[PDB]
Design an enzyme around this catalytic site. Structure first.
Site, PDB file in Angstrom:
ATOM      1  CG  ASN A 182      -0.277  -0.116   2.512  1.00 20.02           C
ATOM      2  OD1 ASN A 182       0.963   0.014   2.604  1.00 20.02           O
ATOM      3  ND2 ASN A 182      -1.066  -0.417   3.573  1.00 20.02           N
ATOM      4  CG  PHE A 183       1.156   4.064   2.584  1.00 22.28           C
ATOM      5  CD1 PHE A 183       0.852   2.944   3.322  1.00 22.28           C
ATOM      6  CD2 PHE A 183       0.749   5.328   3.024  1.00 22.28           C
ATOM      7  CE1 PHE A 183       0.220   3.041   4.547  1.00 22.28           C
ATOM      8  CE2 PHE A 183       0.038   5.458   4.236  1.00 22.28           C
ATOM      9  CZ  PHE A 183      -0.267   4.323   4.977  1.00 22.28           C
ATOM     10  CG  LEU A 197      -3.755   0.385   6.210  1.00 28.93           C
ATOM     11  CD1 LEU A 197      -3.470   1.838   5.738  1.00 28.93           C
ATOM     12  CD2 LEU A 197      -2.854   0.052   7.393  1.00 28.93           C
TER      13      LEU A 197
END
Ligand SMILES: CCCCCCCCCCCCCC(=O)SCCNC(=O)CCNC(=O)[C@H](O)C(C)(C)COP(=O)(O)OP(=O)(O)OC[C@H]1O[C@@H](n2cnc3c(N)ncnc32)[C@H](O)[C@@H]1OP(=O)(O)O
Ligand SMILES: Cc1c(COc2ccc(F)c(F)c2F)oc2cccc(OCCCNCc3cccnc3)c12
Ligand SMILES: [Cl-]
Length: 392
Positions: free
Chosen positions: A113-114, A392
């Site tokens: 992610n990110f 998340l």
């Protein structure tokens, strides 16, 4: 199902691929405040579709610690790209490790992610270069499979889940242009429609405490094991992701609550949600939306296999979640159609959002898993049991 290709980590390149001239690979040290701040500044202004976005995320050091420094985390999996001359951090991509079960096959993975690229460096195909590089760093480090979500349509999604949003301060959500005003509705009608009770109902509901880690870990495992694709938390994971540490976490990120049976004192249910704030860009009434995102939950009522009992218990638990989130001054409560969420989203007045979040596995083939919706993207109680992991 099973892996798609076998990796020999002795034949994996020890050097990264070429970047665009003028840029260079970085490994972020998120224990270093100034480098943490660099990642945060990149994400704050550039984790956005483009210049036209009406919302950006507001990250906090607490959120980034919670998201990126979970058990087993490695700095080699906090990948950056810098401009060589200015040193500015212009992109990122991150992984953290965990274990998942994929139709009864245990799998060590990273959750990726990110992924983020500076707005002015978009459409230069740096994305595949970032993915190939973190892939390389995982291969070198024991890991040949990953799990991740994206809104973008990539090949062979393992599942797709719809976004839902429960207005906690509807008026605010209307004023920032997120929630529409239906029809011949009025603001007052939508405010009445969304009004919540001021107190919880589930007997024995209390904030989770560190003493609950073991029983929550066990309950959550038994509950998630019911799902075709699920996360196999360790005890350390439960402590990291689920137990707020007010000594060390400056701005609370996770809210977790358990149900201690009044007669037995055994914890019989829990739920949790995390805080990720949205910045509202150039709105004269508001500049943030405080969003809570439903995270993990579990209940002993699931194991009866009585769907009516389960619906009834989740309706109580999740309405208490909303009440607690509202009391905590959250403006919206976000959830997806994964877990047993289709049992309660609509009835608790979560509004259907636009499109789908897709789940993918890298280097692992398995039959698609039901994502809580039917083919019309509507929540369907016959299409659950599939996605027992949230990210998340
Ligand atoms: C074993 C270990 C394995 C580890 C790795 C596992 C795989 C992990 C995979 C990554 C999971 C990340 C999970 C998350 O973090 S999902 C969140 C993604 N990040 C954001 O939404 C932040 C805001 N957006 C941006 O920063 C840019 O739009 C990004 C960076 C997303 C695209 O920047 P840009 O617009 O400048 O594009 P490009 O010119 O460089 O490149 C275009 C190519 O990139 C493909 N693309 C675009 N968006 C995504 C996306 N969200 N997932 C996968 N691929 C994506 C695109 O289809 C095209 O593909 P193709 O032409 O090559 O077919
Ligand atoms: C994101 C998201 C939304 C959008 O939420 C709102 C945005 C603006 C508003 F004004 C608002 F009221 C929202 F509810 O609604 C959702 C419903 C279910 C799940 C959702 O996103 C799940 C994943 C969130 N990952 C956020 C992230 C992860 C890594 C880095 N940066 C940001 C979402
Ligand atoms: Cl959304």
């Amino acid at each position: 199902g099973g892996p798609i290709k076998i990796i020999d980590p002795e034949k994996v390149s020890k050097e990264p691929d070429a970047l665009l001239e003028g840029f260079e690979w970085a490994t972020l040290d998120l224990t270093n405040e100034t480098e943490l701040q660099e990642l945060w500044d990149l994400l704050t202004y550039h984790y956005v579709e483009d210049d036209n976005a009406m919302f950006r995320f507001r990250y906090s050091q607490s959120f980034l610690h919670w998201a990126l420094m979970s058990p087993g985390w490695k700095k080699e999996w906090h990948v950056g790209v810098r401009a060589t001359k200015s040193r500015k951090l212009v992109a990122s991509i991150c992984g953290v490790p965990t274990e998942i079960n994929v139709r009864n096959q245990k799998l060590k993975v990273v959750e990726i992610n990110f992924l983020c690229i500076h707005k002015k460096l978009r459409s230069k195909r740096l994305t595949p270069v970032l993915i190939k590089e973190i892939t390389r760093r995982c291969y070198l480090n024991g890991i040949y499979q990953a799990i991740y979500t994206a809104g973008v349509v990539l090949p062979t999604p393992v599942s797709s889940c719809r976004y839902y949003h429960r207005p906690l301060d509807w008026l605010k959500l209307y004023e920032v242009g997120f929630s529409p005003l239906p029809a011949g509705s009025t603001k007052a009608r939508q405010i009445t429609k969304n009004h919540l009770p001021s107190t919880t109902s589930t007997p024995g509901l209390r904030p989770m405490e560190p003493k609950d880690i073991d029983t929550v870990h066990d309950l959550l495992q038994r509950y998630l094991s019911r799902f075709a694709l699920n996360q196999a938390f360790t005890r350390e994971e439960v402590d990291h992701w689920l137990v707020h540490k007010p000594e060390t976490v400056k701005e609370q990120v996770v809210w977790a609550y358990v149900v201690e049976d009044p007669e037995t004192h055994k914890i019989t249910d829990f739920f949790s949600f995390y805080n990720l704030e949205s910045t509202v860009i150039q709105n004269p009434k508001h500049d943030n939306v405080r969003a809570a995102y439903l995270y993990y939950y579990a209940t002993e009522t699931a194991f009866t296999n009585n769907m009516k009992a389960l619906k009834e218990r989740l309706l109580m638990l999740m309405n208490d979640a909303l009440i607690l989130a509202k009391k905590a001054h959250f403006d919206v409560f976000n959830a997806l159609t994964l877990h047993d969420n289709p049992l309660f989203l609509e009835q608790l007045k979560f509004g259907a959002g636009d499109g789908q979040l897709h789940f993918y596995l890298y280097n692992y083939r398995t039959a698609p898993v039901p994502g809580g919706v039917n083919e019309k993207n509507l929540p369907d109680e016959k299409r659950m049991g599939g996605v027992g992991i949230v990210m998340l």
